[PDB]
Structure 1
Amino acid sequence: VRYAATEIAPTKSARARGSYLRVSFKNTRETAQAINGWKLQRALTFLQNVIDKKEAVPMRRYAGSTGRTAQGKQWGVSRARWPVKSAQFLIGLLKNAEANADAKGLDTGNLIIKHIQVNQAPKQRRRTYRAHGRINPYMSNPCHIELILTEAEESHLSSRQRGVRIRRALT
């Protein structure tokens, strides 16, 4: 298996992965960008607060005609939501990476989310019936998630320039 961030060596880092996950890719992308670059325990607390609707995820790219709330002011926006299903999937993956880090023997409390990336999985193809005997697609857009936790951490001058610098050095 190949992760996107190949620069991160696996000696002092942990990783977790999920594939073909029937959870909304857009919501999962927004939640992952919310927790990107964070401490692990802080990210877990934030995701639990999102499940409890005590703190919100800002909707930035996939935010068209969404509601507004007071809880986006922490991120400097107005459009924020609470995607609890994306939060639950990401909590499961973060706990798996924590368990992998504990198996490796790393210090759990010093870990940060160095890499986290959501890709689109092959689409789940349901059908819906419309008026006048028509059928349209009714697809699910699942996602692949991957995440990596990491420990927190005068040449070729001219002769004139050479003479000028020599005279300035003596003087």
Structure 2
Amino acid sequence: VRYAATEIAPTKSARARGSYLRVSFKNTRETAQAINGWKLQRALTFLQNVIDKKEAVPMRRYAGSTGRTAQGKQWGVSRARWPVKSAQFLIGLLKNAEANADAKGLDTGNLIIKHIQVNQAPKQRRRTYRAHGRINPYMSNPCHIELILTEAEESHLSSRQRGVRIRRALT
């Protein structure tokens, strides 16, 4: 398997991934963008607060005609939500990466989320019945998630130019 962030070596990093996960891709993208670049313990605490509705995930791209809340002011937005299922899936993947880091021997308390990325998985094809004997798609849009944690960390001058510089150096 190849991760999208190929620049990060696996010597001092810990990676986790999950595929074909039946959780909303848009909600998961917003949650991952909320915790992108953070320390690991801060991300875990924030995701538990999201589950407990104590902190909100700001809705930036996939936010059309959503609601407004006072908990978006920490992010400078008005539109923010609490994607509990996305938070649960991301907590599971973050704890798997923590276990990988502990097995590898790294320092858990100094790790940051260097890379985190949500991609669209193949869609689940249910159907729904509409009026006048019609059938419409009722699809699920699942996601692939991957994350990587890392340790926190005068040539070719002209002769006139040369002569000017020599004279200034002498005087």
Alignment TM class, shorter chain as reference: over 0.9
Cα deviation, residue 35, structure 1: 0.1
Deviation string 1:31-57 (CA, Å, 9 cap, x unpaired) is: 000000000000000000000000000
In 2, distance between residues paired with 1:81 and 1:150? 28
Cα deviation, residue 119, structure 1: 0.1
Cα deviation, residue 27, structure 1: 0.1
Deviation string 1:110-165 (CA, Å, 9 cap, x unpaired) is: 00000000000000000000000000000000000000000000000000000000
TM-score normalised by the chain length of structure 2: 1.00
In 2, distance between residues paired with 1:98 and 1:167? 64
Count of residues paired in the alignment:
171
Q: Secondary structure at the match of 1:140?
A: coil
Deviation string 1:61-116 (CA, Å, 9 cap, x unpaired) is: 00000000000000000000000000000000000000000000000000000000
TM-score normalised by the chain length of structure 1: 1.00
Unaligned 5+ segments in structure 2 are none
Partner of 2:13: 13
Cα deviation, residue 60, structure 1: 0.2
Partner of 2:164: 164
Partner of 1:82: 82
Question: Which stretches of structure 1, 4 residues or more, deviate above 6 A after TM superposition?
Answer: none
In 2, distance between residues paired with 1:17 and 1:145? 6
Unaligned 5+ segments in structure 1 are none
Q: Secondary structure at the match of 1:14?
A: strand
In 2, distance between residues paired with 1:40 and 1:23? 22
Aligned identity (percent) is: 100
Cα deviation, residue 29, structure 1: 0.1
CA RMSD of aligned residues (A): 0.1
Q: Secondary structure at the match of 1:32?
A: helix
In 2, distance between residues paired with 1:154 and 1:64? 55
Partner of 1:121: 121
